[PDB]
């Protein structure tokens, strides 16, 4: 289609390809919504290939793509207003990733990132996250926003809020964490879990549609791995790292106490301890303002200084009047 | 332990004036300024632009350089000490003008527009701002001593005088008093222009110093001395 | 001794008047000025705001007349905004009046050199770095950079070395002219400084640091 | 809270004073107690508001700009809260769509071979199709 | 421990008729700054609004300010009295001609 309608072939082909750029994006999202567990390999050979074509189209038709991207953000938001998590699908998760591919995430302002990144944050907080499906959906969402701030490293409080409840959800309460609001208490992981077998931490998108203990553990590990990275990249720099990591440290401590074999929280806890040791928590000093100079005013002056008409008229009368009296005399 | 000030917002320091004598400040007197007008329009007489007319007027064109006065004002006004509101400038012209230079003034940097201003200051005897809120340049009554603060130290620039460190000098002087430095803007002449007012004369460098260089050396030392930074 | 670019061993305070707005215009060839030639620069299309070679003049006066030069511990380089590097012999006594100073620059730019009967002013080949001493510290003047002490900075700095200060002769512009050559950016005072004031500030410190007096 | 002047480093501060400032920094501990229920005994005045400083790095630019105000002088007498109280996620999104200033979209020069990880360059490691 | 003044705190600055008025200045001479509002007109407004002139501008309550605004925007409705609310060049040419003839006679 792109070859048959190149810009040079005929007038208006740019517009047709520009509209096709929007059409292609919906096709990429549409296919992901369709079931593909039967032929995952074939779906993988088309899903990535279409994205590559969309990348070429976006290079020339970013404006058309941006308009369609904003429409999807508005449409999904409206669907979230009425269906909540039921509106959310795999295609949404696919949809957000493509913006990261096709747009600059590391901007203070962007047309598509900022509406979307507002919209991930709403999901990370508003959604109940009371099912393994819903927790797995959030785990993907946390990874997307983390990749959005891969260079910017801006602070997202929803990520902190998301991690606290999910970690506490799998330990349900211990009666020590009453400040964390849980939405499900029946997802508590059993004590018999081994935590020494090598379980894949990668969460396939198709497995979500299917959604036990192994699946619960795998979702926990992926979320917890994202936690360790976020401490390393974003929170380490923030001045309030000790305050931000304090609730997380307590939750991770419960994981180690209940599960001694379970190693990663000890690695995170040991890692968290190292950062708090090196970081010097000194009172902030922000009201130092540079002393302000005395004012400066330009001088007022004429460039060529000289050492209305009625006044000029009056001036002439005096001279003529002076002459005449000396004439009469 | 001490309570913080109610407002931490930075406020511009008060603009020093001759009326106030209590506050400590660096007074710089640009003595022997060659600043004179004459009709051709009135134009500031210059050593080079106007030679024949000054010959007709009978004065030496060697001492007909308002450029030197201009450069001294530029470095003086642009010095950080002025930005801190701790320096005020006076100019003693060769015929006998005493000119008060408001620290807030921003003279034109190009000499032609500087000369354009000066003829006006001499004729109107004062200069107003563009917004017409303060008088920046004003001619004032001699002697300079009455304008000078009540408790003050007076010195001049003498090449023959002993070489002194300006920073060490100011530190040894008292905190309530103020320092007056009489700088001779003249290109060449005997250093007795301000002898009647001053009581001592000091040297800064064993090598000769230009008026613009010397006054800048003064203010820089005080800013080190007073931590004006 | 009169310091020269050929000699690199001696400690000296180098200062670079970067982005110098010295330009000659033939209707006769005269130095372009912000006030003297406004419409003419408009025809050339260059902004008249960045057309003040007076800045370069004033810096040289306070710089060349500073005691440090009289002690033979100073050499000056000028980088024209056009891309011309000029070597200023420390022995030169440039005219105090600007209109005369303009007459020298047009002679310099077109003759590429000024000789007196050693060339007092010489146009030299870029880059600036090759002319500089082999072991030398490079800094600029930045309003945003932390405020430091010229006296303390020079004192803690080594002795076999030499110090470069790239002073911006522009009225206004971004402080990235010498980013490529320089390794760090420093502020001299919290308050704003003119180019003439700042180099006067810096040279005064070297006189205090090296006891030139 | 927003600034303790005792821990400012002044360039005129003498080397012995510099040493004293270093010791003060080392020995500081935040005295604010979170579990104390009596607000007059929490020792809040002796602490600092590091949390507000972090909000200056908040992902929302406007929220960051609002948080930045503590770094600026307190010229304004007060802020009208009724312009700030009833904001929701929907309002923020609606405001973003209805923006006075429109900007040109920018693109990413860095290229990723695959968007998702397998089960060359992967944009989103740890997730698979 | 809990005290709340019903009148409210003093207002250092206020916005009336799209004009910023200092609370420190009094109602009459703070309102004078408004364009078209002079000393006598402001005094008449303050009398009609039943606001004590000896008060400062900051002291004015919400109802008093709204009434004053109504006084400004509706003067007639509150019975504010109505009373309260080339040839030269030719002459120059003639004089010039007279001057030329005076020269001619002389």
């Amino acid at each position: 289609i792109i070859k048959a309608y190149q810009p040079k072939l005929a007038e208006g082909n740019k517009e047709k390809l520009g509209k096709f750029t929007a059409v292609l994006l919906r096709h990429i999202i549409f296919l992901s919504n369709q079931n593909y567990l039967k032929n995952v390999q074939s779906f993988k050979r088309t899903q990535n290939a279409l994205i590559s074509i969309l990348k070429s189209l976006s290079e020339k038709y970013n404006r058309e793509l941006s308009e369609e991207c904003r429409d999807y953000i508005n449409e999904m938001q409206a669907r979230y207003k009425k269906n909540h998590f039921d509106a959310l699908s795999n295609g949404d998760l696919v949809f957000f990733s493509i913006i990261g591919i096709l747009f600059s995430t590391s901007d203070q302002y962007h047309l598509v990132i900022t509406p979307a990144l507002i919209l991930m944050s709403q999901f990370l907080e508003q959604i109940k996250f009371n099912s393994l499906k819903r927790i797995a959906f959030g785990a993907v969402l946390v990874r997307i926003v983390s990749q959005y701030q891969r260079i910017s490293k801006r602070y997202i409080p929803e990520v902190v809020y998301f991690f606290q409840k999910i970690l506490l959800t799998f330990i349900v309460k211990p009666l020590d964490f009453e400040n964390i609001r849980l939405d499900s208490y029946e997802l508590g992981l059993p004590l018999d879990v081994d935590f020494t077998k090598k379980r894949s931490t990668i969460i396939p998108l198709h497995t979500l549609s299917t959604m036990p203990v192994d699946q619960c553990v795998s979702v926990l590990l992926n979320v917890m791995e994202s936690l360790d990275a976020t401490i390393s990249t974003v929170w380490k720099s923030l001045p309030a790292f000790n305050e931000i990591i304090l609730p997380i440290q307590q939750l991770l401590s419960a994981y180690t106490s209940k599960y001694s074999d379970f190693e990663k929280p000890r690695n995170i806890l040991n890692k968290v301890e190292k950062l708090t040791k090196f970081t010097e928590h000194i009172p902030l000093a922000l009201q130092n303002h540079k002393p302000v100079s005395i004012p400066t005013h330009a001088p007022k002056y004429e460039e060529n200084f000289n050492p209305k008409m009625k006044a000029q008229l009056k001036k002439e009368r005096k001279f003529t009047m002076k002459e005449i009296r000396k004439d009469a005399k | 332990q001490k309570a913080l000030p109610a407002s931490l917002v930075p406020q511009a320091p008060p603009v020093l004036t001759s009326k106030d004598k209590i506050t400590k400040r660096m007074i710089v007197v640009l003595a022997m300024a060659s600043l004179e007008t004459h009709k051709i329009k009135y134009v500031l007489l210059n050593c080079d632009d106007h030679q024949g007319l000054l010959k007709k007027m009978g004065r030496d064109i060697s001492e007909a350089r308002p450029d030197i006065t201009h450069q001294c004002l530029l470095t003086l006004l642009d010095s950080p000490i002025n930005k801190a509101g701790k320096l005020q400038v006076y100019i003693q012209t060769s015929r006998g003008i005493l000119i008060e230079v408001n620290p807030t003034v921003r003279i034109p940097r190009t000499f032609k527009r500087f000369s354009g201003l000066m003829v006006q200051l001499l004729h109107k005897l004062s200069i107003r701002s563009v917004n017409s809120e303060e008088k920046l340049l004003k001619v004032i009554k001699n002697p300079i001593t009455d304008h000078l603060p009540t408790k003050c130290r007076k010195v001049t620039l003498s090449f023959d005088a002993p070489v002194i460190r300006v920073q060490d000098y100011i530190e040894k002087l008292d905190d309530d008093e103020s320092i007056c430095v009489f700088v001779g803007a003249m290109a060449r002449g005997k250093d007795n222009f301000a002898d009647e007012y001053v009581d001592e004369k000091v040297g800064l460098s064993n090598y000769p110093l230009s008026a613009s260089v010397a006054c800048s050396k003064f203010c820089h030392g005080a800013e080190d001395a007073w931590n004006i930074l | 001794p009169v310091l020269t670019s050929k000699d690199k061993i001696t400690k000296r305070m180098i200062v670079v008047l970067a982005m110098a707005s010295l330009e000659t215009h033939k209707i006769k060839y005269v130095l372009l000025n912000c006030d003297d030639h406004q419409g003419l620069l408009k025809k050339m299309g260059r902004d008249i705001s960045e057309a003040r070679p007076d800045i370069t003049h004033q810096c040289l006066l306070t710089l060349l007349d500073s005691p440090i030069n009289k002690a033979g511990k100073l050499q000056v380089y000028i980088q024209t905004s056009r891309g011309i590097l000029i070597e200023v012999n420390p022995t030169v006594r440039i005219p105090r009046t600007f209109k005369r100073f303009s007459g020298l620059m047009v002679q310099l730019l077109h003759k590429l050199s000024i000789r007196s009967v050693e060339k007092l002013l010489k146009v030299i080949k870029n880059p600036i770095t090759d002319h500089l001493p082999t072991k030398c510290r490079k800094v600029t003047l930045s309003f945003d950079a932390p405020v430091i002490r010229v006296q303390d900075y020079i004192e803690k700095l080594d002795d076999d070395e030499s110090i470069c200060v790239f002073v911006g002769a522009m009225a206004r512009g971004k402080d990235n002219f010498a980013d490529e050559y320089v390794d760090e950016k420093v502020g001299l005072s919290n308050y704003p400084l003119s180019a003439s004031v700042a180099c006067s500030k810096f040279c005064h410190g070297a006189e205090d640091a090296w006891n030139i007096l | 809270m927003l600034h303790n002047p005792a821990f400012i480093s002044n360039p005129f501060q003498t080397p012995d004073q510099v040493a004293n400032l270093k010791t003060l920094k080392e020995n500081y501990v935040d005295p604010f107690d979170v579990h104390e229920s009596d607000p007059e005994l929490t020792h809040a005045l002796d602490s600092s508001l590091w949390e507000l400083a972090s909000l200056m790095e908040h992902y929302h630019p406007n929220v960051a700009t609002l948080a930045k105000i503590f770094a600026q002088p307190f010229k304004k007498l007060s802020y009208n809260m009724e312009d700030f109280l009833d904001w929701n996620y929907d309002s923020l999104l609606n405001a973003e769509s209805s923006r006075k200033l429109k900007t040109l979209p920018t693109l990413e020069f860095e290229a990723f071979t695959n968007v998702f990880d397998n089960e060359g360059n992967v944009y989103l490691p740890g997730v698979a199709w | 421990s809990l005290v709340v003044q019903e009148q409210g705190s003093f207002q250092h600055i206020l916005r009336l008729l799209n004009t910023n008025v200092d609370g420190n200045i009094k109602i009459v001479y703070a309102l004078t700054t408004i364009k078209g509002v002079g000393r006598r007109y402001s005094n008449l407004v303050c009398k009609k609004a039943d606001v004590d002139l000896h008060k400062r501008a900051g002291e004015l309550t919400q109802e008093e300010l709204e009434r004053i605004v109504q006084i400004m925007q509706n003067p007639t409705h509150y019975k504010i009295p109505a009373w309260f609310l080339t040839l030269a060049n030719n002459v120059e040419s003639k004089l010039r001609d007279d001057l030329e003839r005076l020269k001619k006679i002389r």
């Binding site: - | 034109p108 940097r109 190009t110 | 006030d35 008249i48 003040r52 009225a171 206004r172 | - | 916005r15 009336l16």
Partner: peptide, 25 residues
């Protein structure tokens, strides 16, 4: 309640540098 106090707060609500030359004319 917002509308009521939205009304009340309405009344409540209300350099040459470095080397810059004075404006030419």
């Amino acid at each position: 309640d917002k509308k009521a106090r939205r009304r009340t707060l309405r009344f409540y609500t209300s350099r040459f540098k470095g080397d810059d030359d004075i404006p030419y004319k």
